[PDB]
Each structure stands twice: as C-alpha cells, then as structure tokens.
Ligand binder design. Structure first.
Ligand code: NA
Ligand code: NA
Length: 319
DNA sequence: CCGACGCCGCATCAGC
DNA sequence: GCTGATGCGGC
DNA sequence: GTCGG
C-alpha cells in the first residue's frame, strides 16, 4: 500500500504540476501492477521484473523501503505551489492549466474559489458547487435505484429507446463512481438520422422529474451532468448519457463496460484471430493488414463470436 | 538512440 | 461571425 | 518514466 500510495502521488504530481501526462500514465501503470503483485516487495530489483517498473521507480522503491519515505515526495508535499495546484485540480472542470493559473494569481483554496466565482466557467462552478459530493462513491443499491429511474423515465418518452447502464456497475461491482448510460432508437444509425432531438428529449425529461439537476455540457450525442435521488437529502452524483448509433451500440456497450484490462486482452485477442475492435465497430483485417468494412453486431455475443471467444458475462469482465 | 505513449465530444478562446 | 486549437473529463 | 523498434 505504501509503494502504490507513493507511486500514485508521483502520478498526480506529474499530471497536475509537471503536466507530464505520459510520466503520469507510467506511474499509474507501475502502481496498478504493483497493487496486483501477491507478495510484499522486498527490493527495488524485485518489482523491476514487473511490466512498467524500470530503473528509476525501483530506485525509489529501495529508498522508500529503506527509509519509509521518499525525499522527493516530501519536497513536493512542502512547496505550496505544487500542493495548491494539486488540490485545485480536484474541482471538476479545473485541470492542470486552470489550477496553475489560479494559484499564480493567489486562488489557492476552496474559499478563494467561492470569493472568485466570477473567474470560473460553468463546469467549474458546478464542480465547485458539488466538490464534496463528487468525491464520494455511489453504493450499489443506490445505482439500482438510479437505474430504475433512468430506464423507467426514458421508456416513458419513447419505448423504442434502448438504454444500458455500464461501467463497474454492470460488471457487478458494489461501488460506482458515476452513472454511464448508453442510448439508441430506431431512427439513429451511421447511415442516417430521422430524429433531431433524441438525446435532448431524454435530458429535458429527467429534468422534469427533477432527477437531472445540472448540466456540465450537452450536445446531440454526449451529455454530462449532475443527478440525484429524491429525498436525509441524497448526495449529488455525476451522470453521463451517451447517444450512440444502433449499428455501433453493442460495440459501445462492450467497450464502456470494461474493464480496461478486459478490453486490453479482447482487443489483442481479436488481432490474433483476424479482427480489430474499437469502441464503435469490429472490422476484419485483410492478410495485407488493412481493415475491412464493419461487421454487423446485433448483440454483445456477436463480437465474441467473430473472434471465436466463449462469451464472458459482464460480472467476470475483470481480466 | 529515440519517438510513442488515446482519442473523442463539448466548451471556450485565439486569431483572423 | 468563423474556424481551428486547446483544456477538460475519462473510458 | 518505461518500453520497443
Ligand atoms: Na520491467
Ligand atoms: Na478536475
């Protein structure tokens, strides 16, 4: 736990302060595989056999193990610029660029943000408004309640809407972090249109039953906002609603359910058997390497069929 | 040694 | 006003 | 920062 703590700390710092995005992904992967090793690590070199752990992280692992600290992370926990940037990026809509600029002109705390509302954009004010509620997990039976509303609410506007709640939730996790719902209708396909306001008429509707309460961003395919159960008053939760063409929905569902490691191996195994998977389509590879036209997917198993894989129910789409 | 490392929708801004 | 670039969240 | 062509 200590090692993966430290690694993750180095990641957030490289993302938020350094803006070294790839250094951040490297610490992240380094931390994930260590978090999965089933022994207490005893030397740097030991982890060095792992994929993503190289010469510099193992030198840090040795220092941590020898001393219980990392001098570099200490210098970073001092230095008020780094910590205030890092803190401010916890506000949704406040990224490394906004955070750095804020601290440059003295905007360092949540309260500094309150006093400077006029200096925030809309997404940032909402993120600030729900700062504490957004950092708190969503337990399963709450999602189910949240599921029961979106599915039932979107059935009312048009029973030919098809909606699926994905993420950890549908893989069966007991905790969720937000609510990812995918959405389709007979009108909308990659070849055409037939209906202008499909995703609008969902959002307008869950607004009227006062479930959706704020909008971070909205257009004709992606919505981002806040939602909440009816009344203690329930905490506000993040929700995304994604409208996807029918011919790509099930590739959408397969993708947005995960995990990232299950898509990792299914995509790589698809290549073994001659197919390439993206969040949209499964397409064949000519023996020259060029992809063909998208195959048809009517259900999730169709994708599993092409690459000749036994279907893995979302519950065990972990590895 | 050295470039790759994720790619996209929406909001906002720079630059005309 | 237009269009293209960038910040942002996040699977 | 680690990996691989
Ligand atoms: Na290694
Ligand atoms: Na943020």
């Amino acid at each position: 736990g200590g090692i993966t703590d430290m690694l993750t700390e180095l990641a957030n710092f490289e993302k938020n302060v350094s803006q070294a995005i790839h250094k951040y992904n490297a610490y992240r992967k380094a931390a994930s595989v260590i978090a999965k090793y089933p022994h207490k690590i005893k030397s740097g070199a030991e982890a060095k056999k792992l994929p993503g752990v190289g010469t510099k992280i193992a030198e840090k692992i040795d220092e941590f193990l020898a001393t219980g600290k990392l001098r570099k992370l200490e210098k970073i926990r001092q230095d008020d610029t780094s910590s205030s940037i890092n803190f401010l990026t916890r506000v949704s809509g406040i990224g490394p660029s906004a955070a750095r600029k804020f601290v440059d002109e003295g905007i360092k705390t949540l309260e500094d943000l309150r006093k400077n509302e006029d200096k925030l954009n809309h997404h940032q004010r909402i993120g600030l408004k729900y700062f504490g509620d957004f950092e708190k997990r969503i337990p399963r039976e709450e999602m189910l309640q949240m599921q029961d509303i979106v599915l039932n609410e979107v059935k009312k506007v048009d029973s030919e809407y098809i909606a699926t709640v994905c993420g950890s939730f549908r893989r069966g996790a007991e905790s969720s972090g937000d609510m990812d719902v995918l959405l389709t209708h007979p009108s909308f396909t990659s070849e055409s249109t037939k209906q202008p306001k499909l995703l609008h008429q969902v959002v307008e509707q869950l607004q009227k039953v006062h479930f959706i309460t704020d909008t971070l961003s909205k257009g004709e395919t992606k919505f981002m906002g806040v939602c909440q159960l009816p009344s203690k008053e329930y905490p506000h939760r993040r929700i995304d609603i994604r409208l996807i063409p029918k011919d790509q929905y099930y590739c959408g569902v397969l993708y947005f359910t995960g995990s990232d490691i299950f898509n990792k191996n299914m995509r790589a195994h698809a290549l073994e058997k001659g197919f390439t998977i993206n969040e949209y389509t499964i397409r064949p590879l000519g023996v020259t390497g060029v992809a063909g036209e998208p195959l048809p997917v009517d259900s999730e198993k169709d994708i599993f069929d092409y690459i000749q894989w036994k279907y893995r129910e979302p519950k065990d789409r972990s590895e």
